[PDB]
Tab-separated table of C-alpha atoms (C1' of nucleotides) in Angstrom:
chain	number	residue	atom	x	y	z
A	405	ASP	CA	-47.888	17.712	14.090
A	406	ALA	CA	-46.796	16.882	10.741
A	407	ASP	CA	-45.745	12.490	11.773
A	408	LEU	CA	-49.235	12.732	13.825
A	409	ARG	CA	-51.028	13.746	10.709
A	410	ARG	CA	-48.786	10.937	8.492
A	411	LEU	CA	-50.280	8.340	11.229
A	412	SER	CA	-52.738	7.144	8.594
A	413	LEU	CA	-56.169	6.674	10.737
A	414	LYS	CA	-55.624	3.324	11.567
A	415	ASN	CA	-52.392	3.502	13.335
A	416	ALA	CA	-53.661	6.625	15.277
A	417	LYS	CA	-56.734	4.730	16.100
A	418	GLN	CA	-54.560	1.971	17.902
A	419	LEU	CA	-52.230	4.294	19.392
A	420	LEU	CA	-55.459	6.168	21.236
A	421	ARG	CA	-56.476	2.706	22.418
A	422	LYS	CA	-52.786	2.338	23.937
A	423	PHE	CA	-53.080	5.555	25.777
A	424	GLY	CA	-56.314	4.760	27.260
A	425	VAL	CA	-58.794	7.181	25.450
A	426	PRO	CA	-62.247	6.261	25.839
A	427	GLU	CA	-64.134	4.384	22.984
A	428	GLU	CA	-66.360	7.079	21.875
A	429	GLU	CA	-63.630	9.227	20.814
A	430	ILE	CA	-62.120	6.261	19.161
A	431	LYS	CA	-65.234	5.340	17.508
A	432	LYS	CA	-66.452	8.840	15.789
A	433	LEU	CA	-62.713	8.566	14.040
A	434	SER	CA	-62.992	11.985	12.303
A	435	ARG	CA	-59.222	11.784	11.712
A	436	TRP	CA	-58.804	15.490	12.243
A	437	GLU	CA	-60.122	15.231	15.734
A	438	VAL	CA	-58.431	12.093	16.188
A	439	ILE	CA	-55.259	13.755	15.651
A	440	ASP	CA	-56.070	16.974	17.502
A	441	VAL	CA	-56.914	14.324	20.557
A	442	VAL	CA	-53.622	12.300	20.252
A	443	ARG	CA	-51.650	15.378	20.094
A	444	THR	CA	-53.468	16.544	23.365
A	445	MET	CA	-52.835	13.089	24.869
A	446	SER	CA	-49.214	13.095	24.161
A	447	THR	CA	-49.235	16.895	25.616
A	448	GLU	CA	-50.915	15.310	28.956
A	467	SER	CA	-51.309	27.596	28.349
A	468	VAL	CA	-52.480	31.056	29.463
A	469	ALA	CA	-55.334	29.438	31.869
A	470	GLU	CA	-52.409	26.950	33.465
A	471	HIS	CA	-50.111	30.058	34.038
A	472	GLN	CA	-52.546	32.048	36.459
A	473	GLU	CA	-53.904	28.497	37.875
A	474	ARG	CA	-50.394	27.778	38.739
A	475	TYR	CA	-49.808	30.994	40.647
A	476	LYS	CA	-53.420	30.591	42.203
A	477	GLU	CA	-51.660	27.232	43.447
A	478	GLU	CA	-48.603	28.310	44.729
A	479	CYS	CA	-50.583	31.318	46.395
A	480	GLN	CA	-53.095	28.787	47.825
A	481	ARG	CA	-50.049	26.436	49.130
A	482	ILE	CA	-48.239	29.049	51.174
A	483	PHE	CA	-51.066	30.920	52.477
A	484	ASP	CA	-52.243	27.380	54.051
A	485	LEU	CA	-48.987	26.485	54.925
A	486	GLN	CA	-48.750	29.907	56.930
A	487	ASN	CA	-52.337	29.559	58.247
A	488	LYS	CA	-51.070	26.146	60.027
A	489	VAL	CA	-47.672	27.347	61.353
A	490	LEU	CA	-48.599	30.727	63.080
A	491	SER	CA	-51.657	29.113	64.487
A	492	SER	CA	-50.018	25.983	66.106
A	493	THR	CA	-49.512	25.765	69.381
A	494	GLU	CA	-46.724	23.268	69.093
A	495	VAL	CA	-43.568	23.481	71.738
A	496	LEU	CA	-40.505	23.665	69.798
B	1	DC	C1'	-7.998	119.768	78.162
B	2	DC	C1'	-10.870	115.611	78.689
B	3	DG	C1'	-14.544	112.692	78.321
B	4	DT	C1'	-18.202	111.065	75.718
B	5	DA	C1'	-21.201	110.277	71.669
B	6	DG	C1'	-21.361	109.738	66.760
B	7	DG	C1'	-19.497	108.218	62.443
B	8	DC	C1'	-17.758	104.684	59.663
B	9	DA	C1'	-16.116	100.310	58.471
B	10	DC	C1'	-16.331	95.476	58.763
B	11	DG	C1'	-18.562	91.175	60.287
B	12	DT	C1'	-22.705	88.226	59.922
B	13	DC	C1'	-27.562	86.900	58.615
B	14	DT	C1'	-30.537	86.791	55.336
B	15	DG	C1'	-33.203	87.882	51.079
B	16	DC	C1'	-33.192	88.017	46.319
B	17	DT	C1'	-31.903	86.691	41.784
B	18	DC	C1'	-29.633	84.120	38.249
B	19	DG	C1'	-27.390	80.078	36.451
B	20	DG	C1'	-26.744	75.580	36.042
B	21	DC	C1'	-28.044	70.730	36.072
B	22	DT	C1'	-31.586	66.757	35.957
B	23	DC	C1'	-35.796	64.678	35.139
B	24	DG	C1'	-40.110	63.743	33.124
B	25	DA	C1'	-43.045	63.979	29.728
B	26	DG	C1'	-44.080	63.275	24.658
B	27	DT	C1'	-43.726	62.069	19.980
B	28	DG	C1'	-41.462	59.997	15.765
B	29	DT	C1'	-39.408	55.929	14.156
B	30	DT	C1'	-38.219	51.234	13.511
B	31	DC	C1'	-38.526	46.394	14.310
B	32	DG	C1'	-40.909	42.309	15.281
B	33	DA	C1'	-44.930	39.669	15.551
B	34	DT	C1'	-48.850	38.109	13.828
B	35	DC	C1'	-52.624	37.627	10.478
B	36	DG	C1'	-54.357	36.412	6.246
B	37	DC	C1'	-54.234	34.284	1.550
B	38	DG	C1'	-52.967	31.356	-1.413
B	39	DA	C1'	-50.401	26.941	-2.624
B	40	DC	C1'	-49.271	22.144	-1.835
B	41	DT	C1'	-50.647	17.551	-0.837
B	42	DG	C1'	-53.005	13.826	1.069
B	43	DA	C1'	-56.979	11.304	1.034
B	44	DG	C1'	-61.563	9.804	-0.287
B	45	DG	C1'	-65.242	9.029	-3.773
B	46	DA	C1'	-66.662	8.130	-8.329
B	47	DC	C1'	-66.827	7.433	-13.161
B	48	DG	C1'	-65.428	5.335	-17.068
B	49	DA	C1'	-62.701	1.801	-19.550
B	50	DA	C1'	-60.706	-2.896	-20.383
B	51	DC	C1'	-60.530	-7.591	-19.331
B	52	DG	C1'	-62.459	-11.857	-17.718
B	53	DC	C1'	-66.343	-14.977	-17.161
B	54	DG	C1'	-70.466	-17.038	-18.066
B	55	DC	C1'	-73.929	-18.770	-21.033
B	56	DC	C1'	-75.192	-20.399	-25.413
B	57	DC	C1'	-74.881	-22.411	-29.845
B	58	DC	C1'	-72.328	-24.864	-32.877
B	59	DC	C1'	-69.893	-28.277	-34.919
B	60	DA	C1'	-67.772	-32.974	-34.991
B	61	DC	C1'	-68.056	-37.973	-34.107
B	62	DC	C1'	-70.157	-42.004	-33.968
B	63	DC	C1'	-73.753	-45.461	-34.978
B	64	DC	C1'	-78.331	-46.785	-37.029
B	65	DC	C1'	-81.365	-47.299	-41.195
B	66	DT	C1'	-80.900	-52.658	-44.892
B	67	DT	C1'	-79.022	-56.690	-47.834
B	68	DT	C1'	-76.729	-60.791	-48.149
B	69	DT	C1'	-75.130	-65.353	-47.226
B	70	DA	C1'	-73.901	-69.428	-44.919
B	71	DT	C1'	-75.754	-72.058	-40.212
B	72	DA	C1'	-78.313	-73.702	-35.649
B	73	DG	C1'	-80.850	-73.050	-30.504
B	74	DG	C1'	-84.556	-70.607	-28.558
B	75	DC	C1'	-88.962	-67.639	-27.729
B	76	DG	C1'	-93.420	-66.471	-29.676
B	77	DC	C1'	-97.525	-66.144	-32.919
B	78	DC	C1'	-101.348	-68.093	-36.207
B	79	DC	C1'	-104.151	-70.909	-38.673
B	80	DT	C1'	-105.393	-76.305	-39.126
DNA sequence: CCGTAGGCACGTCTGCTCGGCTCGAGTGTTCGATCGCGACTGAGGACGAACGCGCCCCCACCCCCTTTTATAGGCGCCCT
């Protein structure tokens, strides 16, 4: 977070251009918002923890539905 | 005198009581986490001071006013 705020708006603008951030966020260029967006993009937690639980539950549930209903002869 | 019945003793089953063990619930204490506040630092904008630029004025230099005097070609005007 330190060096991202050391980026001195202009180089952070060029970095947001490099990552592929849309031109609206580059255009507004409030520097705190820019550095929060570039920290988020360089990251790209409790809503992900429960979503990964739901994803793991859904995968095996769908897999169990497919195997035990299949009429494939093994 | 003999036979049989009764009484006692021991074994066994269970019914009660006492002791020991273990488990669960609660509360107090201590440690770690998180939040709030203050301080530091970075960035941006505004204000004041100093410098540099532009404009105006002043100063300096050179020529023009005349006279003279020799001497001569050319152009223009004025009265005879």
